[PDB]
């Protein structure tokens, strides 16, 4: 019960959705990582990927738009799914930061995520290419869960748990797409049923995390 | 490089030492765990034991007890499972005195964490154990002190193997007194008095942190 099912189901919906509504974006989804790619990454980082994360990699090794010039277009409402290469390189980058070590580091829910700027076991899987990430937390706080999905990086003094595992994360993104929570071209988020304004996907995830903690 | 060698060598020294100098103590060292036992414990706790810890358990499933580690008892697998569950409930009660770490940021600054697996007890609420959720300047499966009188937590070894070996070296160095008797620690070379082994471990951690400080 790791979220492997959810990862596979999610990718089926996202593969279909992009092909129907945004072929240019579909085309950026890379071919599978092989087991060797993954094993080499696990040996470099001395880390064991959670099963739903490996499952996701064996469907797409991130996103890539070589012939573009305007920048790669992020799948998650502008934020880019990182290649395994980028994952390895960025994790190492963050480890350096962690060795080298302003404001108060906090967590929502409280005590779910370590109250620190950088941790070696925070594996970035998505980037805004501006220092911020979604990824997987392999060293939770005392009221967190192993391999929970968190926001972290340069503008996340407060870290948010946005999903129990990578599978649930992928699935909730796919549900946003199927509900029509988007506009376009480049993909952005809007709440369709409320006729809401365009919103940054991080702000959406943060509001949802805050709501869900409060009533629970 | 996990510390398995060290745990096997350590148990050889401790098995032979107790049979020579305290047979009553030797007699308390239980038979090996079986792999199923460990597998069931892992399933119960949803945790993967480090290799040197599993190796230790496949030599002695704890103690039947006057405590092996200068009065502190090696826990049976069942005691490990039950005590981890106990600390886990405490951690749930606390999501409804300043916690610190030496070295700083090596151990999460909290009273209780689900991923702190106790392996030794003073039978008074304190433990040595393995930390499967280190702070940012900690190491996975580092060995820590924690418990009711450990507002400050100490990293006392890199892995369970190195911990067992440093205990075996204390024995071989003659750093012991018997009060048949009960085993307590004294520094032989200094002709010092009897000391609580935890005060010794803490002191050693503090010394080693200070001497390594200069290097960057």
UniProtKB/Swiss-Prot annotation, chain B:
Family membership: Belongs to the KNR4/SMI1 family.
Disulphide bonds in the chain: none
Protein name: Cell wall assembly regulator SMI1
Signal sequence residues: none
Cellular localisation: Nucleus
Assembly description: Interacts with TYS1.
Function: Protein involved in the regulation of cell wall assembly and 1,3-beta-glucan synthesis, possibly through the transcriptional regulation of cell wall glucan and chitin synthesis.
Species this protein is from: Saccharomyces cerevisiae (strain ATCC 204508 / S288c)
Miscellaneous comment: Present with 5680 molecules/cell in log phase SD medium.
Span within the parent record: 84 to 340 of 505
Domain of life: Eukaryota
């Amino acid at each position: 019960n790791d979220g492997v099912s959810e990862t596979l189901l999610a990718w089926r919906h996202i593969d279909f959705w992009t092909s129907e509504h945004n072929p240019d974006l579909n085309a950026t989804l890379s071919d599978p990582c092989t087991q060797n790619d993954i094993t080499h990454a696990e040996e470099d980082l001395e880390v064991s990927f959670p099963n739903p994360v490996k499952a996701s990699f064996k469907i797409h090794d991130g996103q890539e738009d070589l012939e573009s010039m305007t920048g790669t277009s992020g799948l998650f409402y502008g934020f880019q799914l990182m290649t395994l290469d980028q994952v390895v390189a960025m994790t190492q980058a963050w480890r350096n930061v962690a060795k080298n070590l302003i404001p108060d580091q906090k967590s929502i829910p409280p005590n779910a995520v370590q109250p620190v700027y950088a941790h070696p076991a925070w594996i970035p899987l998505i980037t805004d290419n501006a220092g911020n990430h979604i990824g997987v937390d392999l060293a939770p706080g005392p009221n967190g869960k192993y391999a929970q999905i968190i926001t972290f990086g340069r503008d996340f003094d407060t870290k948010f748990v946005i999903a129990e595992n990578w599978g649930e994360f992928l699935l909730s993104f796919a549900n946003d797409l199927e509900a029509g929570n988007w506009y376009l071209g480049e993909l952005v988020f809007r709440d369709k049923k409320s006729n809401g304004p365009i919103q940054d996907y991080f702000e959406v995830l943060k509001r949802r995390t805050w709501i869900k903690y409060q009533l629970e």
